Design an enzyme around this catalytic site. Structure first.
Site, PDB file in Angstrom:
ATOM      1  N   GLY A 278       0.766  -1.231   0.000  1.00 14.44           N
ATOM      2  CA  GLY A 278       0.000   0.000   0.000  1.00 14.44           C
ATOM      3  C   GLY A 278       0.799   1.285   0.000  1.00 14.44           C
ATOM      4  O   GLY A 278       1.993   1.302   0.316  1.00 14.44           O
TER       5      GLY A 278
ATOM      6  N   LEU B  57       0.679   3.836   2.062  1.00 12.02           N
ATOM      7  CA  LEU B  57       1.217   4.179   3.377  1.00 12.02           C
ATOM      8  C   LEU B  57       2.527   3.486   3.690  1.00 12.02           C
ATOM      9  O   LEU B  57       3.447   4.108   4.225  1.00 12.02           O
ATOM     10  CB  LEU B  57       0.218   3.863   4.488  1.00 12.02           C
ATOM     11  CG  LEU B  57       0.667   4.353   5.869  1.00 12.02           C
ATOM     12  CD1 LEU B  57       0.499   5.862   5.952  1.00 12.02           C
ATOM     13  CD2 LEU B  57      -0.141   3.672   6.951  1.00 12.02           C
TER      14      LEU B  57
ATOM     15  N   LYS C  29       4.705   2.411   1.643  1.00 12.38           N
ATOM     16  CA  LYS C  29       5.722   2.995   0.777  1.00 12.38           C
ATOM     17  C   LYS C  29       6.101   4.421   1.170  1.00 12.38           C
ATOM     18  O   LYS C  29       7.277   4.766   1.195  1.00 12.38           O
ATOM     19  CB  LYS C  29       5.269   2.944  -0.692  1.00 12.38           C
ATOM     20  CG  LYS C  29       5.177   1.523  -1.263  1.00 12.38           C
ATOM     21  CD  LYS C  29       4.827   1.501  -2.750  1.00 12.38           C
ATOM     22  CE  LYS C  29       3.349   1.748  -2.994  1.00 12.38           C
ATOM     23  NZ  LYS C  29       3.008   1.675  -4.441  1.00 12.38           N
TER      24      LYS C  29
ATOM     25  N   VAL D 282      -6.251 -12.088   3.956  1.00 12.09           N
ATOM     26  CA  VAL D 282      -6.518 -12.079   5.394  1.00 12.09           C
ATOM     27  C   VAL D 282      -7.762 -12.843   5.852  1.00 12.09           C
ATOM     28  O   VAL D 282      -7.868 -13.211   7.027  1.00 12.09           O
ATOM     29  CB  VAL D 282      -6.553 -10.640   5.952  1.00 12.09           C
ATOM     30  CG1 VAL D 282      -5.177 -10.012   5.842  1.00 12.09           C
ATOM     31  CG2 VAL D 282      -7.581  -9.805   5.208  1.00 12.09           C
TER      32      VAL D 282
ATOM     33  N   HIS E 129      -1.214  10.109  14.592  1.00  7.13           N
ATOM     34  CA  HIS E 129       0.002  10.835  14.245  1.00  7.13           C
ATOM     35  C   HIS E 129       0.213  12.191  14.917  1.00  7.13           C
ATOM     36  O   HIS E 129       1.347  12.659  15.018  1.00  7.13           O
ATOM     37  CB  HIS E 129       0.232  10.876  12.720  1.00  7.13           C
ATOM     38  CG  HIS E 129      -0.416  12.031  12.022  1.00  7.13           C
ATOM     39  ND1 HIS E 129      -1.655  11.948  11.428  1.00  7.13           N
ATOM     40  CD2 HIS E 129       0.034  13.286  11.772  1.00  7.13           C
ATOM     41  CE1 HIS E 129      -1.949  13.095  10.847  1.00  7.13           C
ATOM     42  NE2 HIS E 129      -0.940  13.923  11.042  1.00  7.13           N
TER      43      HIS E 129
ATOM     44  N   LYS F  79       3.717  13.905  17.145  1.00  7.57           N
ATOM     45  CA  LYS F  79       4.408  15.164  16.848  1.00  7.57           C
ATOM     46  C   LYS F  79       5.227  15.683  18.033  1.00  7.57           C
ATOM     47  O   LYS F  79       4.671  15.972  19.090  1.00  7.57           O
ATOM     48  CB  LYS F  79       3.397  16.231  16.448  1.00  7.57           C
ATOM     49  CG  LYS F  79       2.592  15.880  15.223  1.00  7.57           C
ATOM     50  CD  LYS F  79       1.556  16.944  14.932  1.00  7.57           C
ATOM     51  CE  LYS F  79       0.856  16.656  13.627  1.00  7.57           C
ATOM     52  NZ  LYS F  79       1.831  16.622  12.507  1.00  7.57           N
TER      53      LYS F  79
ATOM     54  N   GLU G 104      -6.128  24.378   8.733  1.00 11.36           N
ATOM     55  CA  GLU G 104      -5.572  23.903   7.472  1.00 11.36           C
ATOM     56  C   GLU G 104      -6.009  24.825   6.358  1.00 11.36           C
ATOM     57  O   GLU G 104      -7.151  25.287   6.322  1.00 11.36           O
ATOM     58  CB  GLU G 104      -6.068  22.503   7.145  1.00 11.36           C
ATOM     59  CG  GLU G 104      -5.748  21.452   8.171  1.00 11.36           C
ATOM     60  CD  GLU G 104      -6.282  20.099   7.761  1.00 11.36           C
ATOM     61  OE1 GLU G 104      -5.503  19.305   7.192  1.00 11.36           O
ATOM     62  OE2 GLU G 104      -7.483  19.839   7.990  1.00 11.36           O
TER      63      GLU G 104
ATOM     64  N   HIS H 154      -7.465  13.680  16.655  1.00 12.19           N
ATOM     65  CA  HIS H 154      -6.377  14.619  16.888  1.00 12.19           C
ATOM     66  C   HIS H 154      -6.612  15.608  18.020  1.00 12.19           C
ATOM     67  O   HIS H 154      -5.847  15.647  18.984  1.00 12.19           O
ATOM     68  CB  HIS H 154      -6.057  15.341  15.585  1.00 12.19           C
ATOM     69  CG  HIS H 154      -5.731  14.410  14.463  1.00 12.19           C
ATOM     70  ND1 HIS H 154      -4.921  13.305  14.627  1.00 12.19           N
ATOM     71  CD2 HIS H 154      -6.120  14.400  13.166  1.00 12.19           C
ATOM     72  CE1 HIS H 154      -4.823  12.658  13.481  1.00 12.19           C
ATOM     73  NE2 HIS H 154      -5.544  13.300  12.579  1.00 12.19           N
TER      74      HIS H 154
ATOM     75  N   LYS I 237      -2.094  27.365   7.891  1.00  5.97           N
ATOM     76  CA  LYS I 237      -1.869  26.033   8.426  1.00  5.97           C
ATOM     77  C   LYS I 237      -1.330  26.318   9.820  1.00  5.97           C
ATOM     78  O   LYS I 237      -0.350  27.058   9.973  1.00  5.97           O
ATOM     79  CB  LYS I 237      -0.814  25.296   7.593  1.00  5.97           C
ATOM     80  CG  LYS I 237      -0.290  24.016   8.225  1.00  5.97           C
ATOM     81  CD  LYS I 237      -1.410  23.013   8.432  1.00  5.97           C
ATOM     82  CE  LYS I 237      -0.938  21.795   9.201  1.00  5.97           C
ATOM     83  NZ  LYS I 237      -2.114  20.978   9.604  1.00  5.97           N
TER      84      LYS I 237
HETATM   85  O1  LIG Z   1      -1.411  18.454   9.796  1.00  2.45           O
HETATM   86  P1  LIG Z   1      -0.885  17.179   9.297  1.00  2.45           P
HETATM   87  O2  LIG Z   1      -0.178  16.404  10.337  1.00  2.45           O
HETATM   88  O3  LIG Z   1      -0.278  17.176   7.948  1.00  2.45           O
HETATM   89  O4  LIG Z   1      -2.225  16.306   9.107  1.00  2.45           O
HETATM   90  C1  LIG Z   1      -3.308  16.805   8.293  1.00  2.45           C
HETATM   91  C2  LIG Z   1      -4.163  15.641   7.813  1.00  2.45           C
HETATM   92  O5  LIG Z   1      -4.481  14.837   8.970  1.00  2.45           O
HETATM   93  C3  LIG Z   1      -5.220  13.656   8.634  1.00  2.45           C
HETATM   94  O6  LIG Z   1      -5.465  12.958   9.804  1.00  2.45           O
HETATM   95  C4  LIG Z   1      -6.553  14.037   8.001  1.00  2.45           C
HETATM   96  O7  LIG Z   1      -7.257  12.855   7.660  1.00  2.45           O
HETATM   97  C5  LIG Z   1      -6.321  14.892   6.759  1.00  2.45           C
HETATM   98  O8  LIG Z   1      -7.564  15.340   6.234  1.00  2.45           O
HETATM   99  C6  LIG Z   1      -5.448  16.096   7.114  1.00  2.45           C
HETATM  100  O9  LIG Z   1      -5.118  16.808   5.931  1.00  2.45           O
END
Ligand SMILES: O=P(O)(O)OC[C@H]1O[C@@H](O)[C@H](O)[C@@H](O)[C@@H]1O
Ligand SMILES: NC(=O)C1=CN([C@@H]2O[C@H](COP(=O)(O)OP(=O)(O)OC[C@H]3O[C@@H](n4cnc5c(N)ncnc54)[C@H](OP(=O)(O)O)[C@@H]3O)[C@@H](O)[C@H]2O)C=CC1
Ligand SMILES: NC(=O)C1=CN([C@@H]2O[C@H](COP(=O)(O)OP(=O)(O)OC[C@H]3O[C@@H](n4cnc5c(N)ncnc54)[C@H](OP(=O)(O)O)[C@@H]3O)[C@@H](O)[C@H]2O)C=CC1
Ligand SMILES: O=P(O)(O)OC[C@H]1O[C@@H](O)[C@H](O)[C@@H](O)[C@@H]1O
Ligand SMILES: [Ca+2]
Ligand SMILES: [Ca+2]
Lengths: 485, 485
Positions: free
Chosen positions: B15, B17, B19, B86, B178, B182, B216, B240, B343
């Site tokens: 997939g 991700l 890669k 799977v 994720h 950070k 964003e 998040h 952003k």
């Molecule tokens: O701000 P970062 O860490 O690049 O993450 C932004 C992205 O986070 C992802 O979790 C969302 O699904 C995306 O829609 C979003 O663009």
């Protein structure tokens, strides 16, 4: 702006100070629209000069500050002069004439300030005659601006205070302390009381130690004759350092009026401990600068007018103790010297390290609030954060702020502040008798030991931050100087 | 460095991700000397590829990170592949072969991680068979890394949790978030607990309100199909935002172990209030971006794959309430949207204004501790100080710190962190079941109202910071958004 209607009489109006600081500071107050029509400046000294000759002295004084000549001239028209000896009781009627002449000429209803820009030996004398020969306004106010130094010990300071109180109440007495007049020094109260996070932390529970540093790169150079009997102790510690320490150690006031401010400051001053011989040797370090690396940096002993066997102190470092509940066990370190690494007047509030364990190789360290006053105003805060590592670990980072050019340029010089404050009748940025007496009482205990030479005289390389003993002083309590140069 | 002896099996190893993020993150851990000899990576997916073909996929994946080819090859020798469906219970023996083959080849004593980089519908299935078909190590540890999203509601999340707990204990489950990965987000705990001045102020007595902003500038652009049923609420808020809010709201732990950290965070989560229809309308704002100024910024309704009558939310703003003694009455504002001014992922701790009166025209204002996470890490502190004026007056000044290039470049990417943490068995930077369940419970109450359309759908100019209702939300409590764009 609201017009300031006042009349200022400058004793020693031909002197260097009047020309360098006093007159231009008054001109600035005029340019800023504060002094308008109802104000007059009467200069005085022994030397005879007719109005035309005096106005030229005033004209040269404000030349480097003159951009519009017509503005300069309009200002000069408010100046008058009278030759006069301060020890001549009869010659005071002449001065009273000039003052009352100016009062009528510009329609000034009382409000008189008498600036004594003369040697200390004339302070008391001038005061007596201002009252006896009838120079004091019968309306408005009467305020006396006393130039540095206010005494040279507690006894002399106390005598001076007695002579002055014969004609004025302590609240009419505005002693000159230019460090209190520095914009950054007045930020201490704003930072502390204006931010609850700091206000609530300004005590023994949060702070580890407080540091006041008045570092200078200049040597004695010019004024050794006077400096050889004053030293760093009286030149910078007794006056400058002690009054900054007062802004830091003060309790929290009932309000922000000069009265409550002073009360709060005195609450700490009355708590300051005075040392004996054994304690001076324990909590204080006196030093004299030797040669640096460059030949240009010659020892103190080779400076012009310095006795080849002088044991005078060009550097002082010491630990103050306030027996106040809020400062119980908190060391207040002060240092001031010549021929040091850099010019720097700053205050460092070192907070205690947190006791929370992260498990990291580097646990929490002491946070530091630093207020830089000279050369350039700045505020810094050393905080604990996470290091950019794989394994969790802490590290200190420095947050920073510096004055902009707009700030730097709109900031009034100490003398302009002090005068402006005196005209407003604001004693916030002035030491009262209580502060000065205690400052002297504290310094006298130290001087006694030095005069008796029952304490060591350290030495230091011209250009360092002091003798090693300065470091060992703090190390004993597990502290170090924040500013390293 | 201490060698990490582990074996990772990547489900969905062909997939995008795997890669883009997964493989290079593993390579970084190898370059840093963490992964040495005793480690192996088994890739898997349905598509058939022989070892030679797979290794090339791995080779391309880490091309932009390869500086030394010989190093790249040494790393590639640890990779193997097996085609596999799977849903085929029998085909799991093949996978078990590969894993045990690799285990013998590199002498890895247990320690297995199963990364599920596959669609959610396969999560539970894969788990059951990892246990039943005997893929779980009999020594060392066994950990399951579950990719986003962990459910799409509380019910689905709870079902998923049930299927997974059939083969693993909650402490073996490492859900991917994720934002928790950070570097700057991990500073929150260090700043707070590492500096007593902040630690002691992290409560209702000092703080006025807390702000979390995930702004964003990008629109939906690419993934509208999936995004049209998720919206900002589930895409950024539920995962998040909520987990950052957890780092801020957490009580003070007994220690810094993931266990106590989680307990502390849960103490707050269990205190979070869940709203009803009337309250959602009161404390939350949902919006959809319209056109900006530029034609390039078309409304959401004109994006590829977006239903012309969509009432989906591309922006969410809301007030969280923790019924904890320490947060009693403290609003927690959260906002996240697309097509905004800039952003920016930041946290703003707004402290209450001091009540000490200076007599000035401008009294003390609210201090602000700002932690900027994206784009560039920075820490700022808005403090009260004295303005450069003649009349005493206060003003706010901003102290600042920013990451250096040394920091920026040595900072590990979220995926490298998450994997590295999983191998170490550290759940600090991972949400546990309790956190996720409550996050869903909270979000579900809101979703119910939107699905039922019993709440308004605001609109905003593409490029602003949101609908005006976002501002009015805070204004009601006498607050405003610190970040304006
Ligand atoms: O701000 P970062 O860490 O690049 O993450 C932004 C992205 O986070 C992802 O979790 C969302 O699904 C995306 O829609 C979003 O663009
Ligand atoms: O050092 P500075 O030269 O800077 O100034 C000394 C000042 O004190 C004045 N002064 C000295 N003695 C007397 C006095 N006895 N009466 C009045 N003014 C005096 C001087 O005036 P003067 O010019 O009269 O000495 C001068 O203005
Ligand atoms: O989106 P992406 O293309 O990024 O990746 C999807 C991943 O899921 C894998 N996958 C899909 N269905 C299965 C399955 N049923 N069993 C195993 N792997 C699967 C794909 O492998 P594949 O190449 O087999 O589709 C691919 O590796
Ligand atoms: O640091 P500033 O404000 O220039 O003041 C320094 C001077 O202050 C004066 O008070 C001292 O008598 C001088 O010796 C010293 O040089
Ligand atoms: Ca001690
Ligand atoms: Ca409210």
């Amino acid at each position: 702006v609201s017009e300031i209607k006042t009349l200022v009489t400058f004793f020693g109006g031909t002197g260097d100070l009047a020309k360098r600081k006093l007159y231009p500071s008054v001109f600035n107050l005029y340019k800023k629209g504060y002094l308008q029509k109802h104000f007059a400046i009467v200069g005085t000294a022994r030397q005879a000069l007719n109005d035309d000759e005096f106005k030229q002295l005033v004209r040269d004084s404000i030349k480097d500050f003159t951009d519009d000549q017509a503005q300069a001239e309009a200002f000069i028209e408010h100046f008058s002069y009278r030759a006069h000896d301060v020890t001549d009781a009869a010659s005071y009627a002449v001065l009273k004439e000039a003052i009352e002449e100016a009062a009528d000429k510009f329609d000034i209803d009382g409000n008189r300030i008498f600036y004594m820009s003369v040697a200390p030996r004339f302070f008391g004398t001038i005061a007596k005659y201002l009252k006896s020969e009838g120079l004091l306004a019968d309306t408005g106010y009467n305020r006396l601006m006393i130039e540095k130094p206010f005494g040279t010990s507690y006894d002399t300071a106390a005598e001076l205070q007695n002579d002055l109180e014969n004609a004025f109440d302590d609240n009419q007495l505005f002693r000159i302390n230019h460090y209190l007049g520095k914009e950054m020094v007045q930020n201490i109260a704003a930072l502390r009381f204006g931010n609850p996070i700091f206000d609530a932390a300004w005590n023994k529970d949060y702070i580890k130690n407080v540091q006041v540093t008045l570092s200078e790169v200049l040597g004695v150079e010019e004024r050794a004759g006077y400096y050889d009997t004053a030293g760093a102790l009286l030149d910078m510690i007794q006056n400058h350092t002690m009054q900054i320490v007062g802004w830091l150690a003060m309790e929290k006031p009932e309000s922000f009026t000069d009265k409550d401010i002073r009360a709060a400051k005195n609450a700490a001053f009355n708590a300051l401990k005075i040392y004996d011989e054994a304690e001076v040797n324990k909590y204080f370090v006196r030093a004299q600068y030797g040669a640096g690396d460059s030949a240009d940096f010659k020892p103190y002993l080779e400076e012009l007018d310095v006795p080849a066997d002088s044991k005078n102190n060009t550097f002082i470092a010491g630990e103050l103790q306030f027996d106040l509940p809020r400062w119980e066990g908190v060391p207040f370190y002060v240092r001031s010297g010549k021929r040091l690494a850099a010019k720097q007047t700053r205050v460092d509030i070192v907070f205690k390290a947190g006791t929370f364990n992260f498990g990291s190789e580097q646990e929490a360290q002491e946070a530091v609030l630093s207020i830089i006053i000279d050369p350039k105003g700045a505020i810094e805060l050393k905080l604990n954060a996470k290091s950019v590592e794989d394994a969790f670990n802490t590290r200190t980072i420095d947050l920073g702020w510096t004055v902009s050019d707009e700030d730097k340029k709109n900031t009034p010089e100490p003398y302009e502040r002090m005068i402006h404050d005196t005209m407003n009748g604001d004693g916030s940025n002035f030491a009262d008798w209580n502060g000065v007496s205690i400052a002297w009482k504290f310094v006298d205990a130290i001087s006694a030991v030095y005069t008796a030479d029952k304490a060591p005289l350290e030495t230091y390389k011209s250009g360092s931050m002091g003798p090693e003993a300065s470091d060992k002083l703090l190390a004993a309590n597990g502290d170090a100087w924040v500013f390293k140069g």
